[PDB]
Ligand binder design. Sequence first.
Ligand SMILES: O=c1[nH]c(=O)n([C@H]2C[C@H](O)[C@@H](COP(=O)(O)O)O2)cc1CO
Ligand SMILES: O=c1[nH]c(=O)n([C@H]2C[C@H](O)[C@@H](COP(=O)(O)O)O2)cc1CO
Lengths: 129, 129
Amino acid sequence: MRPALYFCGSIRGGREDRTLYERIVSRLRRFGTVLTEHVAGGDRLIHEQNLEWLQQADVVVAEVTQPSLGVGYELGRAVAFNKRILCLFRPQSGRVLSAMIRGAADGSRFQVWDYEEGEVEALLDRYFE
Amino acid sequence: MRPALYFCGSIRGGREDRTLYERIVSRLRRFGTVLTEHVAGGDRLIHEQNLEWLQQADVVVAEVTQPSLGVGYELGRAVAFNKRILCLFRPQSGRVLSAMIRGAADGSRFQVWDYEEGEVEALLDRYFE
Ligand SMILES: O=c1[nH]c(=O)n([C@H]2C[C@H](O)[C@@H](COP(=O)(O)O)O2)cc1CO
Ligand SMILES: O=c1[nH]c(=O)n([C@H]2C[C@H](O)[C@@H](COP(=O)(O)O)O2)cc1CO
């Protein structure tokens, strides 16, 4: 019925980019249904729901600037499902993207884009149009 | 020829637990060959080598206290390979383990152990003997 875009960003890793994430999610809605956590014993259900969303998504979009086990885990499951993946990283003095994420990239099905906050809407438009 | 144990810990996520990791690795050597990064354009090879180590390991051991994309990614690939997994977490004021890692646990093939530094050698002995 509609293209599904899975979005993932850090939560327990840190909520420093929480405002940037809502900007990304709101842009993504222009291109399809966005499947993403709504962030304010429960962990198993959280794992289940994100795994199902990732599996049925047509594109996986990850903001990978803040280090996060959960985001890395979701990317690992996404790769093993051979998902189309877009990773968004903001270079910063003292912050280097994991070699496991940068090294997973191939420039087509798994893309890593270095960007800064001001251009994120333009980047998303360019990737999705 | 020998049982292989894959060990993963944060690097670009942060090297705060680097001394704890060497203690874990040195204990793991008692139980088999330890496949792990030796930490002091290169990312693709790093990704390749860890992915091959994880795939041929008989147990995957991850220290998941420090949030890390790479460790999460390795756990995601390990789960999709249906690896036997042992995750080690140290609870701390203000630090909560990712729901994606805690929620992935099943108490048998994927185990999450909460522990503190003083007992890590005893824990490893108990899991591996
Ligand atoms: O409460 C939550 N709800 C949720 O959906 N997640 C999923 C989605 C996030 O993209 C990702 C964040 O992982 P982490 O919490 O380790 O930073 O894991 C993670 C948490 C907290 O771990
Ligand atoms: O230089 C490296 N060598 C290496 O083997 N890795 C692998 C193994 C680590 O267990 C894991 C750490 O990931 P991260 O760097 O995102 O914290 O990724 C990661 C890096 C740096 O990303």
